Amino acid sequence: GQLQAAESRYEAQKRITQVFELEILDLYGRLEKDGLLKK
Amino acid sequence: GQLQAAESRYEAQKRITQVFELEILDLYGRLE
Amino acid sequence: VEEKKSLEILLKDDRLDTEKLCTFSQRFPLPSMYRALVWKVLLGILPPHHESHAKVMMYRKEQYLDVLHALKVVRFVSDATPQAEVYLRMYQLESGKLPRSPSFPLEPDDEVFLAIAKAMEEMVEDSVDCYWITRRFVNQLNTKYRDSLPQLPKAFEQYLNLEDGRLLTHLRMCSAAPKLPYDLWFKRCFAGCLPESSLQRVWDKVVSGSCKILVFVAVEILLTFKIKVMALNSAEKITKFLENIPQDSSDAIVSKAIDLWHKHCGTP
Protein backbone atom coordinates (compact mmCIF):
# COMPACT_ATOMS: atom_id res chain seq x y z
CA GLY A 1 0.00 0.00 0.00
CA GLN A 2 2.66 2.51 1.09
CA LEU A 3 4.99 1.34 -1.71
CA GLN A 4 2.29 1.76 -4.37
CA ALA A 5 1.94 5.42 -3.38
CA ALA A 6 5.72 5.89 -3.51
CA GLU A 7 5.80 4.48 -7.06
CA SER A 8 2.89 6.79 -7.93
CA ARG A 9 5.10 9.75 -6.96
CA TYR A 10 8.01 8.45 -9.06
CA GLU A 11 5.95 7.99 -12.23
CA ALA A 12 4.44 11.48 -11.87
CA GLN A 13 7.83 13.08 -11.45
CA LYS A 14 9.02 11.10 -14.50
CA ARG A 15 6.23 12.70 -16.51
CA ILE A 16 7.30 16.17 -15.35
CA THR A 17 10.89 15.44 -16.37
CA GLN A 18 9.86 14.18 -19.80
CA VAL A 19 7.88 17.43 -20.41
CA PHE A 20 10.90 19.53 -19.47
CA GLU A 21 13.00 17.21 -21.62
CA LEU A 22 10.98 18.02 -24.78
CA GLU A 23 10.91 21.74 -23.84
CA ILE A 24 14.73 21.69 -23.65
CA LEU A 25 15.02 19.91 -27.01
CA ASP A 26 12.67 22.51 -28.48
CA LEU A 27 14.74 25.35 -26.99
CA TYR A 28 18.06 23.96 -28.29
CA GLY A 29 16.42 23.64 -31.71
CA ARG A 30 15.28 27.29 -31.61
CA LEU A 31 18.67 28.73 -30.65
CA GLU A 32 20.27 26.67 -33.41
CA LYS A 33 17.87 28.29 -35.92
CA ASP A 34 18.75 31.74 -34.54
CA GLY A 35 22.36 30.96 -35.51
CA LEU A 36 21.18 30.38 -39.11
CA LEU A 37 19.35 33.75 -39.33
CA LYS A 38 22.83 35.21 -38.75
CA LYS A 39 23.97 34.20 -42.28
CA GLY B 1 13.89 -2.19 2.12
CA GLN B 2 11.89 -2.04 -1.11
CA LEU B 3 10.29 1.25 -0.04
CA GLN B 4 13.64 2.97 0.58
CA ALA B 5 14.69 2.15 -2.97
CA ALA B 6 11.38 3.47 -4.33
CA GLU B 7 11.90 6.77 -2.52
CA SER B 8 15.46 6.83 -3.83
CA ARG B 9 14.00 6.79 -7.36
CA TYR B 10 11.62 9.66 -6.57
CA GLU B 11 14.33 11.85 -5.04
CA ALA B 12 16.66 11.25 -7.97
CA GLN B 13 13.92 12.21 -10.44
CA LYS B 14 13.32 15.34 -8.38
CA ARG B 15 17.00 16.27 -8.81
CA ILE B 16 16.81 15.72 -12.57
CA THR B 17 13.86 18.09 -12.76
CA GLN B 18 15.77 20.79 -10.86
CA VAL B 19 18.70 20.52 -13.28
CA PHE B 20 16.43 20.71 -16.32
CA GLU B 21 14.65 23.68 -14.72
CA LEU B 22 17.93 25.60 -14.50
CA GLU B 23 19.02 24.51 -17.98
CA ILE B 24 15.75 25.86 -19.40
CA LEU B 25 16.15 29.16 -17.58
CA ASP B 26 19.73 29.38 -18.87
CA LEU B 27 18.52 28.68 -22.43
CA TYR B 28 15.74 31.30 -22.28
CA GLY B 29 18.34 33.76 -20.98
CA ARG B 30 20.67 32.99 -23.90
CA LEU B 31 17.92 33.47 -26.48
CA GLU B 32 17.36 37.24 -26.08
CA VAL C 1 39.27 -22.15 2.47
CA GLU C 2 37.42 -23.04 5.69
CA GLU C 3 36.61 -19.32 6.11
CA LYS C 4 34.69 -19.17 2.80
CA LYS C 5 32.30 -21.93 3.92
CA SER C 6 31.33 -20.18 7.17
CA LEU C 7 30.33 -17.11 5.13
CA GLU C 8 28.20 -19.18 2.75
CA ILE C 9 26.23 -20.29 5.83
CA LEU C 10 25.42 -16.62 6.60
CA LEU C 11 24.48 -16.01 2.95
CA LYS C 12 21.90 -18.86 2.96
CA ASP C 13 19.63 -17.05 5.45
CA ASP C 14 16.39 -15.81 3.90
CA ARG C 15 17.00 -12.66 5.95
CA LEU C 16 20.67 -11.63 6.09
CA ASP C 17 22.05 -10.69 9.51
CA THR C 18 23.95 -7.53 8.58
CA GLU C 19 25.52 -7.47 12.08
CA LYS C 20 27.19 -10.85 11.46
CA LEU C 21 28.34 -9.91 7.95
CA CYS C 22 30.24 -6.96 9.46
CA THR C 23 31.93 -8.93 12.24
CA PHE C 24 32.96 -11.48 9.58
CA SER C 25 34.29 -8.81 7.19
CA GLN C 26 36.18 -7.27 10.11
CA ARG C 27 37.87 -10.57 11.05
CA PHE C 28 38.27 -12.27 7.66
CA PRO C 29 39.03 -11.27 4.05
CA LEU C 30 36.15 -11.60 1.58
CA PRO C 31 36.16 -14.24 -1.16
CA SER C 32 36.44 -12.64 -4.63
CA MET C 33 33.08 -13.99 -5.77
CA TYR C 34 31.12 -12.73 -2.76
CA ARG C 35 32.79 -9.32 -2.34
CA ALA C 36 30.36 -7.35 -4.54
CA LEU C 37 27.34 -8.97 -2.88
CA VAL C 38 28.49 -8.37 0.69
CA TRP C 39 29.56 -4.78 0.03
CA LYS C 40 26.15 -4.11 -1.53
CA VAL C 41 24.29 -5.59 1.45
CA LEU C 42 26.38 -3.67 4.00
CA LEU C 43 26.18 -0.37 2.12
CA GLY C 44 22.36 -0.71 2.02
CA ILE C 45 22.28 -1.07 -1.76
CA LEU C 46 20.52 -4.39 -1.20
CA PRO C 47 18.22 -5.07 1.73
CA PRO C 48 18.78 -8.02 4.08
CA HIS C 49 15.93 -10.07 2.50
CA HIS C 50 17.48 -11.67 -0.59
CA GLU C 51 14.09 -12.20 -2.22
CA SER C 52 13.78 -8.41 -2.65
CA HIS C 53 17.29 -8.18 -4.15
CA ALA C 54 16.14 -8.65 -7.74
CA LYS C 55 13.24 -6.23 -7.39
CA VAL C 56 15.40 -3.59 -5.65
CA MET C 57 18.26 -3.80 -8.17
CA MET C 58 15.60 -3.02 -10.76
CA TYR C 59 14.94 0.31 -9.08
CA ARG C 60 18.69 0.99 -8.83
CA LYS C 61 18.96 0.19 -12.55
CA GLU C 62 16.17 2.60 -13.53
CA GLN C 63 17.71 5.28 -11.32
CA TYR C 64 21.10 4.75 -12.98
CA LEU C 65 19.59 5.13 -16.46
CA ASP C 66 17.35 8.09 -15.56
CA VAL C 67 20.26 10.05 -14.15
CA LEU C 68 22.69 9.10 -16.90
CA HIS C 69 20.16 10.03 -19.58
CA ALA C 70 19.51 13.40 -17.90
CA LEU C 71 23.22 14.24 -18.19
CA LYS C 72 23.10 13.49 -21.93
CA VAL C 73 20.08 15.80 -22.28
CA VAL C 74 21.96 18.72 -20.72
CA ARG C 75 25.11 17.91 -22.77
CA PHE C 76 27.19 17.24 -19.64
CA VAL C 77 28.51 13.87 -20.87
CA SER C 78 29.00 12.12 -24.22
CA ASP C 79 30.40 8.76 -25.35
CA ALA C 80 33.86 10.38 -25.31
CA THR C 81 33.66 10.96 -21.52
CA PRO C 82 35.54 8.47 -19.28
CA GLN C 83 33.38 6.23 -17.05
CA ALA C 84 34.89 7.62 -13.83
CA GLU C 85 33.92 11.13 -15.00
CA VAL C 86 30.40 9.92 -15.76
CA TYR C 87 30.07 8.48 -12.25
CA LEU C 88 31.26 11.83 -10.89
CA ARG C 89 28.66 13.78 -12.85
CA MET C 90 25.94 11.34 -11.76
CA TYR C 91 27.03 11.68 -8.16
CA GLN C 92 27.02 15.48 -8.46
CA LEU C 93 23.50 15.45 -9.95
CA GLU C 94 22.15 13.06 -7.31
CA SER C 95 23.67 15.19 -4.50
CA GLY C 96 22.64 18.46 -6.20
CA LYS C 97 26.06 20.00 -6.86
CA LEU C 98 26.28 19.87 -10.63
CA PRO C 99 28.34 22.86 -11.88
CA ARG C 100 27.27 24.98 -14.88
CA SER C 101 29.69 23.51 -17.46
CA PRO C 102 31.97 20.46 -17.93
CA SER C 103 34.80 22.93 -18.68
CA PHE C 104 34.52 24.38 -15.14
CA PRO C 105 37.52 23.15 -13.07
CA LEU C 106 37.23 20.23 -10.65
CA GLU C 107 37.38 21.10 -6.94
CA PRO C 108 39.44 19.07 -4.38
CA ASP C 109 36.47 16.89 -3.28
CA ASP C 110 35.61 15.99 -6.89
CA GLU C 111 39.15 14.71 -7.54
CA VAL C 112 38.89 12.46 -4.48
CA PHE C 113 35.71 10.88 -5.87
CA LEU C 114 37.37 10.51 -9.25
CA ALA C 115 40.36 8.66 -7.77
CA ILE C 116 38.09 6.24 -5.89
CA ALA C 117 35.76 5.78 -8.85
CA LYS C 118 38.79 4.69 -10.90
CA ALA C 119 39.81 2.18 -8.20
CA MET C 120 36.29 0.75 -7.87
CA GLU C 121 36.18 0.37 -11.64
CA GLU C 122 38.87 -2.35 -11.45
CA MET C 123 37.23 -4.11 -8.49
CA VAL C 124 33.66 -4.11 -9.80
CA GLU C 125 32.98 -4.77 -13.49
CA ASP C 126 29.22 -4.05 -13.54
CA SER C 127 28.63 -0.37 -14.36
CA VAL C 128 25.58 -0.10 -12.12
CA ASP C 129 27.14 -1.92 -9.14
CA CYS C 130 30.36 0.05 -9.55
CA TYR C 131 28.52 3.39 -9.42
CA TRP C 132 26.22 2.48 -6.55
CA ILE C 133 29.07 1.06 -4.49
CA THR C 134 31.28 4.10 -5.22
CA ARG C 135 28.36 6.36 -4.29
CA ARG C 136 27.59 4.77 -0.95
CA PHE C 137 31.28 4.20 -0.16
CA VAL C 138 32.07 7.90 -0.63
CA ASN C 139 28.83 9.00 1.05
CA GLN C 140 29.91 6.92 4.06
CA LEU C 141 33.13 8.96 4.36
CA ASN C 142 31.17 12.24 4.47
CA THR C 143 28.55 11.09 7.00
CA LYS C 144 29.44 8.01 9.08
CA TYR C 145 33.10 9.12 9.20
CA ARG C 146 32.69 12.92 8.99
CA ASP C 147 34.24 13.40 12.45
CA SER C 148 36.60 10.37 12.43
CA LEU C 149 38.71 10.94 9.29
CA PRO C 150 40.11 14.34 10.31
CA GLN C 151 41.51 12.81 13.53
CA LEU C 152 43.48 10.06 11.73
CA PRO C 153 46.62 12.16 11.08
CA LYS C 154 46.94 12.68 14.85
CA ALA C 155 46.45 8.92 15.38
CA PHE C 156 48.96 8.08 12.64
CA GLU C 157 51.70 9.68 14.73
CA GLN C 158 50.48 8.18 17.99
CA TYR C 159 50.45 4.64 16.52
CA LEU C 160 53.71 5.04 14.59
CA ASN C 161 55.27 6.12 17.89
CA LEU C 162 54.02 2.87 19.42
CA GLU C 163 55.63 0.75 16.67
CA ASP C 164 58.79 2.72 15.80
CA GLY C 165 59.54 6.00 17.58
CA ARG C 166 62.94 6.44 15.91
CA LEU C 167 61.30 6.52 12.51
CA LEU C 168 58.82 9.10 13.82
CA THR C 169 61.83 11.00 15.19
CA HIS C 170 63.50 10.96 11.76
CA LEU C 171 60.33 12.32 10.15
CA ARG C 172 60.17 15.12 12.72
CA MET C 173 63.93 15.75 12.14
CA CYS C 174 63.22 16.60 8.55
CA SER C 175 60.02 18.48 9.45
CA ALA C 176 58.33 15.88 7.20
CA ALA C 177 55.54 14.89 9.62
CA PRO C 178 53.18 17.78 8.71
CA LYS C 179 53.75 17.34 4.93
CA LEU C 180 52.85 13.63 4.64
CA PRO C 181 50.20 12.81 1.98
CA TYR C 182 47.40 12.53 4.52
CA ASP C 183 44.76 13.34 1.89
CA LEU C 184 45.93 10.39 -0.23
CA TRP C 185 45.59 8.07 2.77
CA PHE C 186 42.58 9.45 4.64
CA LYS C 187 40.38 11.16 2.03
CA ARG C 188 41.08 8.87 -0.94
CA CYS C 189 41.64 5.78 1.25
CA PHE C 190 44.81 4.85 -0.67
CA ALA C 191 43.10 5.01 -4.09
CA GLY C 192 45.91 5.53 -6.60
CA CYS C 193 48.45 4.45 -4.00
CA LEU C 194 47.99 0.68 -3.72
CA PRO C 195 47.01 -1.78 -6.48
CA GLU C 196 43.35 -2.74 -6.46
CA SER C 197 43.89 -6.46 -5.72
CA SER C 198 45.38 -5.52 -2.33
CA LEU C 199 43.39 -2.32 -1.77
CA GLN C 200 40.03 -4.09 -1.84
CA ARG C 201 41.06 -6.20 1.20
CA VAL C 202 41.48 -2.87 3.02
CA TRP C 203 38.11 -1.60 1.82
CA ASP C 204 36.51 -4.81 3.13
CA LYS C 205 37.13 -3.29 6.58
CA VAL C 206 36.15 0.28 5.65
CA VAL C 207 32.78 -0.89 4.34
CA SER C 208 32.23 -3.10 7.40
CA GLY C 209 32.46 -0.04 9.70
CA SER C 210 36.07 0.81 10.64
CA CYS C 211 38.05 3.74 9.19
CA LYS C 212 40.84 3.36 11.78
CA ILE C 213 42.23 0.54 9.59
CA LEU C 214 43.49 3.23 7.19
CA VAL C 215 45.92 4.46 9.87
CA PHE C 216 47.55 1.04 10.33
CA VAL C 217 47.91 0.68 6.58
CA ALA C 218 49.73 4.03 6.55
CA VAL C 219 51.84 2.94 9.52
CA GLU C 220 52.76 -0.36 7.88
CA ILE C 221 53.83 1.46 4.71
CA LEU C 222 56.49 3.31 6.69
CA LEU C 223 57.53 0.22 8.67
CA THR C 224 57.85 -1.76 5.43
CA PHE C 225 59.99 0.91 3.70
CA LYS C 226 61.91 1.95 6.80
CA ILE C 227 65.41 1.46 5.39
CA LYS C 228 64.50 3.44 2.27
CA VAL C 229 62.99 6.34 4.26
CA MET C 230 65.87 6.58 6.76
CA ALA C 231 68.22 7.14 3.82
CA LEU C 232 66.30 10.30 2.82
CA ASN C 233 66.80 13.62 4.63
CA SER C 234 64.25 16.11 3.30
CA ALA C 235 60.51 16.58 3.75
CA GLU C 236 60.16 17.02 -0.02
CA LYS C 237 62.21 13.88 -0.80
CA ILE C 238 60.20 11.81 1.73
CA THR C 239 56.77 12.92 0.50
CA LYS C 240 57.70 12.40 -3.17
CA PHE C 241 58.65 8.80 -2.32
CA LEU C 242 55.43 8.10 -0.40
CA GLU C 243 53.28 9.38 -3.28
CA ASN C 244 54.86 6.82 -5.67
CA ILE C 245 55.59 3.67 -3.64
CA PRO C 246 56.62 0.18 -4.92
CA GLN C 247 53.56 -1.84 -6.00
CA ASP C 248 54.97 -5.36 -5.46
CA SER C 249 55.22 -5.17 -1.64
CA SER C 250 51.59 -4.04 -1.20
CA ASP C 251 50.22 -7.61 -0.75
CA ALA C 252 52.30 -8.08 2.41
CA ILE C 253 51.64 -4.52 3.62
CA VAL C 254 47.87 -4.99 3.77
CA SER C 255 48.15 -8.35 5.56
CA LYS C 256 50.56 -6.94 8.15
CA ALA C 257 48.47 -3.76 8.54
CA ILE C 258 45.37 -5.79 9.42
CA ASP C 259 47.30 -7.79 12.06
CA LEU C 260 48.59 -4.47 13.39
CA TRP C 261 45.05 -3.05 13.51
CA HIS C 262 43.69 -6.16 15.29
CA LYS C 263 46.55 -5.95 17.79
CA HIS C 264 45.95 -2.36 18.85
CA CYS C 265 42.13 -2.35 18.63
CA GLY C 266 41.31 -5.95 19.70
CA THR C 267 38.29 -6.66 17.48
CA PRO C 268 35.62 -9.13 18.78
Side-chain angles (χ1 to χ4, degrees), chain C residues 186-205:
Chain C
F186 306 145
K187 291 184 193 240
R188 303 187 174 190
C189 310
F190 303 95
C193 175
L194 304 176
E196 283 74 27
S197 52
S198 303
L199 183 53
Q200 66 192 338
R201 298 199 294 117
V202 175
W203 289 6
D204 286 348
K205 280 55 173 151

PDB file of all heavy atoms in Angstrom, chain C residues 186-205:
ATOM      1  N   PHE C 186      43.774   9.323   3.799  1.00  0.00           N
ATOM      2  CA  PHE C 186      42.581   9.450   4.644  1.00  0.00           C
ATOM      3  C   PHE C 186      41.383  10.167   4.018  1.00  0.00           C
ATOM      4  O   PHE C 186      40.330  10.255   4.649  1.00  0.00           O
ATOM      5  CB  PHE C 186      42.945  10.131   5.968  1.00  0.00           C
ATOM      6  CG  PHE C 186      44.072   9.465   6.710  1.00  0.00           C
ATOM      7  CD1 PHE C 186      44.982  10.226   7.433  1.00  0.00           C
ATOM      8  CD2 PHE C 186      44.210   8.080   6.715  1.00  0.00           C
ATOM      9  CE1 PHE C 186      46.017   9.627   8.131  1.00  0.00           C
ATOM     10  CE2 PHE C 186      45.245   7.476   7.406  1.00  0.00           C
ATOM     11  CZ  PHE C 186      46.149   8.251   8.116  1.00  0.00           C
ATOM     12  N   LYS C 187      41.534  10.689   2.804  1.00  0.00           N
ATOM     13  CA  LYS C 187      40.379  11.155   2.031  1.00  0.00           C
ATOM     14  C   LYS C 187      40.118  10.225   0.852  1.00  0.00           C
ATOM     15  O   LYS C 187      38.972   9.899   0.562  1.00  0.00           O
ATOM     16  CB  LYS C 187      40.565  12.598   1.555  1.00  0.00           C
ATOM     17  CG  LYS C 187      40.537  13.628   2.676  1.00  0.00           C
ATOM     18  CD  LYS C 187      40.632  15.050   2.139  1.00  0.00           C
ATOM     19  CE  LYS C 187      40.922  16.067   3.241  1.00  0.00           C
ATOM     20  NZ  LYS C 187      39.853  17.095   3.379  1.00  0.00           N
ATOM     21  N   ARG C 188      41.187   9.787   0.192  1.00  0.00           N
ATOM     22  CA  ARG C 188      41.083   8.870  -0.938  1.00  0.00           C
ATOM     23  C   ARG C 188      41.225   7.405  -0.532  1.00  0.00           C
ATOM     24  O   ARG C 188      41.100   6.521  -1.374  1.00  0.00           O
ATOM     25  CB  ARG C 188      42.148   9.208  -1.980  1.00  0.00           C
ATOM     26  CG  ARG C 188      42.095  10.638  -2.486  1.00  0.00           C
ATOM     27  CD  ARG C 188      43.075  10.826  -3.627  1.00  0.00           C
ATOM     28  NE  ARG C 188      42.974  12.146  -4.243  1.00  0.00           N
ATOM     29  CZ  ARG C 188      43.575  12.494  -5.381  1.00  0.00           C
ATOM     30  NH1 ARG C 188      44.338  11.627  -6.043  1.00  0.00           N
ATOM     31  NH2 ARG C 188      43.411  13.724  -5.862  1.00  0.00           N
ATOM     32  N   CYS C 189      41.507   7.149   0.744  1.00  0.00           N
ATOM     33  CA  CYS C 189      41.636   5.781   1.254  1.00  0.00           C
ATOM     34  C   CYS C 189      42.587   4.937   0.407  1.00  0.00           C
ATOM     35  O   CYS C 189      42.277   3.799   0.055  1.00  0.00           O
ATOM     36  CB  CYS C 189      40.265   5.119   1.332  1.00  0.00           C
ATOM     37  SG  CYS C 189      39.044   6.131   2.185  1.00  0.00           S
ATOM     38  N   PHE C 190      43.740   5.519   0.083  1.00  0.00           N
ATOM     39  CA  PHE C 190      44.807   4.850  -0.674  1.00  0.00           C
ATOM     40  C   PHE C 190      44.472   4.546  -2.138  1.00  0.00           C
ATOM     41  O   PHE C 190      45.165   3.753  -2.777  1.00  0.00           O
ATOM     42  CB  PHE C 190      45.265   3.572   0.047  1.00  0.00           C
ATOM     43  CG  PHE C 190      45.746   3.811   1.448  1.00  0.00           C
ATOM     44  CD1 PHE C 190      44.892   3.650   2.531  1.00  0.00           C
ATOM     45  CD2 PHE C 190      47.052   4.210   1.684  1.00  0.00           C
ATOM     46  CE1 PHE C 190      45.335   3.877   3.822  1.00  0.00           C
ATOM     47  CE2 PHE C 190      47.500   4.440   2.972  1.00  0.00           C
ATOM     48  CZ  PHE C 190      46.641   4.274   4.042  1.00  0.00           C
ATOM     49  N   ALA C 191      43.436   5.184  -2.680  1.00  0.00           N
ATOM     50  CA  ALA C 191      43.096   5.008  -4.090  1.00  0.00           C
ATOM     51  C   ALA C 191      44.115   5.750  -4.948  1.00  0.00           C
ATOM     52  O   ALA C 191      44.267   6.973  -4.840  1.00  0.00           O
ATOM     53  CB  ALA C 191      41.690   5.509  -4.374  1.00  0.00           C
ATOM     54  N   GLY C 192      44.812   4.998  -5.796  1.00  0.00           N
ATOM     55  CA  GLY C 192      45.906   5.533  -6.603  1.00  0.00           C
ATOM     56  C   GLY C 192      47.255   5.295  -5.958  1.00  0.00           C
ATOM     57  O   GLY C 192      48.291   5.604  -6.547  1.00  0.00           O
ATOM     58  N   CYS C 193      47.238   4.742  -4.746  1.00  0.00           N
ATOM     59  CA  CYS C 193      48.454   4.446  -4.001  1.00  0.00           C
ATOM     60  C   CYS C 193      48.769   2.961  -4.118  1.00  0.00           C
ATOM     61  O   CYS C 193      49.831   2.585  -4.608  1.00  0.00           O
ATOM     62  CB  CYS C 193      48.282   4.841  -2.534  1.00  0.00           C
ATOM     63  SG  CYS C 193      49.664   4.385  -1.467  1.00  0.00           S
ATOM     64  N   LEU C 194      47.831   2.127  -3.679  1.00  0.00           N
ATOM     65  CA  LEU C 194      47.989   0.675  -3.718  1.00  0.00           C
ATOM     66  C   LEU C 194      47.240   0.071  -4.901  1.00  0.00           C
ATOM     67  O   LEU C 194      46.242   0.639  -5.358  1.00  0.00           O
ATOM     68  CB  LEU C 194      47.462   0.061  -2.426  1.00  0.00           C
ATOM     69  CG  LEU C 194      48.082   0.590  -1.132  1.00  0.00           C
ATOM     70  CD1 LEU C 194      47.406  -0.036   0.079  1.00  0.00           C
ATOM     71  CD2 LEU C 194      49.578   0.327  -1.105  1.00  0.00           C
ATOM     72  N   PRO C 195      47.715  -1.086  -5.404  1.00  0.00           N
ATOM     73  CA  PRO C 195      47.012  -1.778  -6.483  1.00  0.00           C
ATOM     74  C   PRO C 195      45.712  -2.372  -5.976  1.00  0.00           C
ATOM     75  O   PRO C 195      45.610  -2.733  -4.803  1.00  0.00           O
ATOM     76  CB  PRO C 195      47.984  -2.879  -6.898  1.00  0.00           C
ATOM     77  CG  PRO C 195      48.795  -3.137  -5.682  1.00  0.00           C
ATOM     78  CD  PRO C 195      48.923  -1.816  -4.983  1.00  0.00           C
ATOM     79  N   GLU C 196      44.732  -2.474  -6.864  1.00  0.00           N
ATOM     80  CA  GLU C 196      43.351  -2.738  -6.458  1.00  0.00           C
ATOM     81  C   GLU C 196      43.142  -4.129  -5.845  1.00  0.00           C
ATOM     82  O   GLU C 196      42.271  -4.305  -4.991  1.00  0.00           O
ATOM     83  CB  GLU C 196      42.384  -2.496  -7.630  1.00  0.00           C
ATOM     84  CG  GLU C 196      42.104  -1.018  -7.916  1.00  0.00           C
ATOM     85  CD  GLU C 196      43.256  -0.286  -8.587  1.00  0.00           C
ATOM     86  OE1 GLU C 196      44.064  -0.930  -9.292  1.00  0.00           O
ATOM     87  OE2 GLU C 196      43.341   0.947  -8.419  1.00  0.00           O
ATOM     88  N   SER C 197      43.941  -5.101  -6.273  1.00  0.00           N
ATOM     89  CA  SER C 197      43.885  -6.458  -5.719  1.00  0.00           C
ATOM     90  C   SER C 197      44.130  -6.473  -4.208  1.00  0.00           C
ATOM     91  O   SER C 197      43.475  -7.212  -3.471  1.00  0.00           O
ATOM     92  CB  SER C 197      44.905  -7.360  -6.423  1.00  0.00           C
ATOM     93  OG  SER C 197      46.193  -6.773  -6.422  1.00  0.00           O
ATOM     94  N   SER C 198      45.077  -5.656  -3.757  1.00  0.00           N
ATOM     95  CA  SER C 198      45.377  -5.516  -2.335  1.00  0.00           C
ATOM     96  C   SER C 198      44.409  -4.551  -1.670  1.00  0.00           C
ATOM     97  O   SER C 198      43.881  -4.830  -0.593  1.00  0.00           O
ATOM     98  CB  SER C 198      46.801  -4.997  -2.142  1.00  0.00           C
ATOM     99  OG  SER C 198      47.744  -5.852  -2.763  1.00  0.00           O
ATOM    100  N   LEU C 199      44.190  -3.414  -2.326  1.00  0.00           N
ATOM    101  CA  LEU C 199      43.393  -2.323  -1.768  1.00  0.00           C
ATOM    102  C   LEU C 199      41.994  -2.761  -1.358  1.00  0.00           C
ATOM    103  O   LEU C 199      41.475  -2.318  -0.334  1.00  0.00           O
ATOM    104  CB  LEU C 199      43.304  -1.169  -2.775  1.00  0.00           C
ATOM    105  CG  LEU C 199      42.567   0.105  -2.344  1.00  0.00           C
ATOM    106  CD1 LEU C 199      43.107   0.646  -1.028  1.00  0.00           C
ATOM    107  CD2 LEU C 199      42.663   1.163  -3.433  1.00  0.00           C
ATOM    108  N   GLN C 200      41.381  -3.632  -2.150  1.00  0.00           N
ATOM    109  CA  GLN C 200      40.035  -4.092  -1.836  1.00  0.00           C
ATOM    110  C   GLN C 200      39.958  -4.820  -0.488  1.00  0.00           C
ATOM    111  O   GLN C 200      38.952  -4.713   0.209  1.00  0.00           O
ATOM    112  CB  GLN C 200      39.453  -4.944  -2.973  1.00  0.00           C
ATOM    113  CG  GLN C 200      40.146  -6.272  -3.227  1.00  0.00           C
ATOM    114  CD  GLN C 200      39.713  -6.909  -4.540  1.00  0.00           C
ATOM    115  OE1 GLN C 200      38.638  -6.612  -5.072  1.00  0.00           O
ATOM    116  NE2 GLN C 200      40.555  -7.788  -5.073  1.00  0.00           N
ATOM    117  N   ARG C 201      41.023  -5.525  -0.107  1.00  0.00           N
ATOM    118  CA  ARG C 201      41.064  -6.199   1.200  1.00  0.00           C
ATOM    119  C   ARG C 201      41.087  -5.197   2.356  1.00  0.00           C
ATOM    120  O   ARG C 201      40.690  -5.529   3.480  1.00  0.00           O
ATOM    121  CB  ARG C 201      42.261  -7.147   1.296  1.00  0.00           C
ATOM    122  CG  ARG C 201      42.230  -8.271   0.271  1.00  0.00           C
ATOM    123  CD  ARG C 201      43.138  -9.439   0.636  1.00  0.00           C
ATOM    124  NE  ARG C 201      44.557  -9.075   0.618  1.00  0.00           N
ATOM    125  CZ  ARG C 201      45.379  -9.099   1.670  1.00  0.00           C
ATOM    126  NH1 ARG C 201      44.961  -9.479   2.876  1.00  0.00           N
ATOM    127  NH2 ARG C 201      46.647  -8.741   1.508  1.00  0.00           N
ATOM    128  N   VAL C 202      41.560  -3.983   2.078  1.00  0.00           N
ATOM    129  CA  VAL C 202      41.476  -2.869   3.023  1.00  0.00           C
ATOM    130  C   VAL C 202      40.041  -2.364   3.081  1.00  0.00           C
ATOM    131  O   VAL C 202      39.482  -2.160   4.159  1.00  0.00           O
ATOM    132  CB  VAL C 202      42.403  -1.695   2.620  1.00  0.00           C
ATOM    133  CG1 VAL C 202      42.208  -0.498   3.546  1.00  0.00           C
ATOM    134  CG2 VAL C 202      43.859  -2.135   2.624  1.00  0.00           C
ATOM    135  N   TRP C 203      39.454  -2.156   1.908  1.00  0.00           N
ATOM    136  CA  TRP C 203      38.109  -1.600   1.816  1.00  0.00           C
ATOM    137  C   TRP C 203      37.035  -2.556   2.334  1.00  0.00           C
ATOM    138  O   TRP C 203      35.946  -2.117   2.693  1.00  0.00           O
ATOM    139  CB  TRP C 203      37.826  -1.148   0.382  1.00  0.00           C
ATOM    140  CG  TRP C 203      38.604   0.096  -0.003  1.00  0.00           C
ATOM    141  CD1 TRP C 203      39.569   0.734   0.735  1.00  0.00           C
ATOM    142  CD2 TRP C 203      38.492   0.831  -1.223  1.00  0.00           C
ATOM    143  NE1 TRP C 203      40.046   1.822   0.056  1.00  0.00           N
ATOM    144  CE2 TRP C 203      39.406   1.906  -1.151  1.00  0.00           C
ATOM    145  CE3 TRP C 203      37.702   0.693  -2.370  1.00  0.00           C
ATOM    146  CZ2 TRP C 203      39.550   2.838  -2.183  1.00  0.00           C
ATOM    147  CZ3 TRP C 203      37.846   1.622  -3.397  1.00  0.00           C
ATOM    148  CH2 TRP C 203      38.763   2.678  -3.295  1.00  0.00           C
ATOM    149  N   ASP C 204      37.348  -3.850   2.398  1.00  0.00           N
ATOM    150  CA  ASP C 204      36.510  -4.809   3.129  1.00  0.00           C
ATOM    151  C   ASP C 204      36.200  -4.271   4.527  1.00  0.00           C
ATOM    152  O   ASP C 204      35.053  -4.299   4.977  1.00  0.00           O
ATOM    153  CB  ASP C 204      37.208  -6.176   3.268  1.00  0.00           C
ATOM    154  CG  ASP C 204      37.233  -6.984   1.966  1.00  0.00           C
ATOM    155  OD1 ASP C 204      36.529  -6.631   0.993  1.00  0.00           O
ATOM    156  OD2 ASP C 204      37.966  -7.998   1.925  1.00  0.00           O
ATOM    157  N   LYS C 205      37.237  -3.773   5.199  1.00  0.00           N
ATOM    158  CA  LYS C 205      37.127  -3.289   6.578  1.00  0.00           C
ATOM    159  C   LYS C 205      36.450  -1.920   6.661  1.00  0.00           C
ATOM    160  O   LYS C 205      35.693  -1.653   7.600  1.00  0.00           O
ATOM    161  CB  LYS C 205      38.508  -3.236   7.247  1.00  0.00           C
ATOM    162  CG  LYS C 205      39.016  -4.577   7.762  1.00  0.00           C
ATOM    163  CD  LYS C 205      39.042  -5.655   6.686  1.00  0.00           C
ATOM    164  CE  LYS C 205      39.705  -6.931   7.177  1.00  0.00           C
ATOM    165  NZ  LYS C 205      39.171  -8.141   6.491  1.00  0.00           N
TER     166      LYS C 205
END
